[PDB]
Ligand binder design. Structure first.
Ligand code: CA
Ligand code: CL
Ligand code: CL
Ligand code: NA
Length: 606
């Protein structure tokens, strides 16, 4: 009666010209501010008017449509359990639910009040400090109840360790927005990457006409953009999504005259953002922290000579001075303008020879770039030497040169041995970028994640192929309860799919796992599984968990409906929702799963 008056109050405006068609039904549902899938609404509307002359609906029809799309049985069961089948939850009943079923302890009497004030739409009920079913569905569908832990949505990790101690969000050939051979270069590559909190961007520099450097993929048909315009974009967007330092990975193919223009543009456009001298003493023996370098941009490039020479050359104009460096950097001796060489302080790109050579001779401010194929050989045959390397030196992996369509390797292979800059083609849809985007949700999306302790100890014996005494076993149980408004199959003429859910663990080889639910026939709107999945994970700090929702098409084919990936240790506990993303990386809202999550680590217990 209260609920009904609230509801009529919102929608009745819509019926002022009598019964409404489909386009008006849609416009009216939006007034209730719950997201809906058009195909689902279209279906329930067609079933409502199927055997009728006019294909219009009245107010009672519209209520039934709303109830079918928005109300969820799985939420009703829970609500009636805490309400004792009353119409509303008392504030003490809601408190009970928050503490016992979502483990939202410490300030639960507090959070109950806040849930009501934030989500209860019926003014009457809100004033009695109660929650209606309408308010409960809004709360349970909100960002307060998603599976990613609220505490991980801010920068919570220790940001005061040396730079080498972090995983760093890293993009390959950032200027490309499609393939590697014939598609465009575009400033949007840089804008998009930076807005996702990417910290290490690649710029391939080539000589332009008019003596002005340009950016494109050398020896291809990709279009060109000006170097100048890339630096203007970096100036505007570097710190849009994160406070933490950006690295510009320059792959230089310019003549020395155009290299001087590179240096000038960097200096003049970026100003005080650009790091142009050591923070401390000039004899650098460990890298500064991300915290020490907030709001700075660092140049990664080849360098001729010492930092000491750089500090001396600052007393004069260095125009016309050139060095020699050990290679031209290309995807698997050259002249350098010293004006450009002199912008390199903590991020000197150094040719890789061997792990032994690096141990003997490389400095902490020297990084290495290793192609996919070589790095995979080292992971397979020398994983602990690789860990020893990455604990000391910033290491960048990039995709092999034959990936001319911008496909990506699996990045988890390299994170498993502590590689800091695992560079991906950010533009390309696929599981690699889903793992990347999931991983770098953590630590507030700032693009730096502190590596586990066993990858930072310079004398670690960690081997991902045989974890042994580094194991920290975690037991995980996930109840898959339901799905809601899943995207219909591309083949359904109405609103059907045959959904199943695959749960995946990515991590060290012994932890990798796949589980599938049963297939539900012909129900995308409200499939109910109630199925329990169990895992043990030996190295939870490196693990990512992915929910992959598929449509069983035929005996030999499943289609992708949506997915979500996050770090295993960022899982919320108790009842929560899994938001889903399309292959393009678009939000499929309202498509969701409803689960109950519990896990514990063996290390808590004597
Ligand atoms: Ca490149
Ligand atoms: Cl490819
Ligand atoms: Cl891919
Ligand atoms: Na552009």
């Amino acid at each position: 009666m209260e609920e009904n008056r609230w509801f009529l109050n919102i929608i009745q405006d819509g019926f002022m010209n009598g019964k409404i068609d489909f386009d008006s039904t849609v416009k009216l549902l939006e007034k209730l501010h719950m997201p809906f899938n058009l195909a689902h609404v279209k279906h329930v509307f067609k079933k409502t008017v199927d055997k009728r002359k006019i294909h219009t609906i009245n107010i009672e029809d519209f209520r039934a449509i709303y109830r079918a799309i928005v109300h969820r049985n799985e939420f009703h069961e829970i609500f009636c359990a805490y309400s004792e089948n009353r119409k509303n939850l008392a504030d003490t009943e809601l408190t009970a639910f928050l503490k016992k079923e979502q483990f939202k302890t410490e300030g639960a009497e507090t959070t109950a009040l806040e849930v009501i004030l934030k989500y209860e739409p019926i003014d009457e009920v809100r004033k009695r400090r109660q929650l209606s079913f309408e308010g409960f569905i809004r709360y349970m569908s909100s960002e307060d109840c998603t599976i990613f832990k609220k505490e991980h949505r801010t920068v919570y990790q220790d940001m005061n360790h040396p730079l080498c101690d972090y995983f760093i969000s890293s993009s390959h050939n950032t200027y490309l927005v499609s393939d590697q051979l014939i598609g465009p270069s575009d400033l949007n590559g840089y804008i998009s990457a930076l807005l996702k909190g990417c910290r290490c961007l690649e710029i391939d520099c080539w000589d332009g006409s008019n003596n002005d450097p340009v950016v494109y993929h050398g020896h291809t048909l990709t279009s060109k953009i000006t170097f100048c315009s890339v630096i203007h974009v970096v100036d505007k967007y570097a710190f849009a999504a994160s406070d933490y330092p950006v690295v510009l990975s320059l792959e230089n193919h310019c003549s020395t005259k155009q290299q001087e223009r590179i240096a000038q543009y960097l200096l003049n456009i970026l100003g005080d953002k650009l790091l142009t001298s050591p923070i401390g003493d000039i004899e650098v023996t460990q890298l500064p922290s991300p915290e020490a370098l907030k709001f700075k941009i660092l140049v990664k490039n080849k360098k001729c000579g010492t930092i000491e020479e750089t500090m001396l050359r600052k007393g004069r104009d260095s125009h016309g001075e050139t060095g020699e460096v050990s290679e031209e950097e290309i995807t698997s001796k050259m002249k350098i303008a010293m004006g450009l060489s002199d912008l390199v302080i903590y991020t000197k790109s150094e040719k890789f020879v061997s792990f032994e050579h690096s141990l003997a001779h490389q400095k902490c401010y020297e990084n290495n770039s290793i192609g996919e194929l070589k790095a995979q050989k080292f992971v397979k045959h020398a994983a602990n030497q690789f860990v020893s390397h990455t604990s000391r030196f910033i290491t960048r992996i990039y995709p092999k040169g034959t990936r001319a369509g911008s496909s990506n390797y699996n990045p988890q292979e390299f994170w498993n041995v502590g590689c800091q800059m695992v560079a991906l083609n950010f533009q390309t849809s696929g599981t690699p970028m889903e793992l990347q985007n999931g991983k770098f949700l953590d630590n507030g999306g700032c693009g730096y994640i502190l590596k586990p302790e066993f990858l930072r100890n310079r004398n670690s014996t960690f081997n991902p192929h045989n974890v042994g005494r580094y194991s920290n076993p975690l037991s995980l149980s996930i109840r898959l309860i339901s799905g809601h408004q899943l995207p219909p199959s591309n083949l359904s003429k109405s609103n059907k799919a045959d959904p199943l859910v695959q749960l995946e663990i990515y991590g060290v080889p012994e932890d990798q796992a796949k589980r599938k639910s049963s297939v539900i026939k012909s129900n995308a709107l409200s499939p109910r599984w109630d199925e329990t999945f169990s895992f043990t994970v030996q190295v939870p700090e490196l693990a990512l968990i992915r929910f992959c929702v598929q449509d069983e098409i035929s005996l030999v084919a499943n289609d992708f409906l949506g997915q979500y990936t996050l770090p295993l240790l960022s899982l919320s506990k108790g009842y929560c929702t899994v938001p889903l993303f399309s292959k393009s990386g678009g939000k499929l809202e309202p498509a969701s799963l409803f689960v109950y999550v519990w896990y514990y680590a063996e290390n808590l217990y004597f």
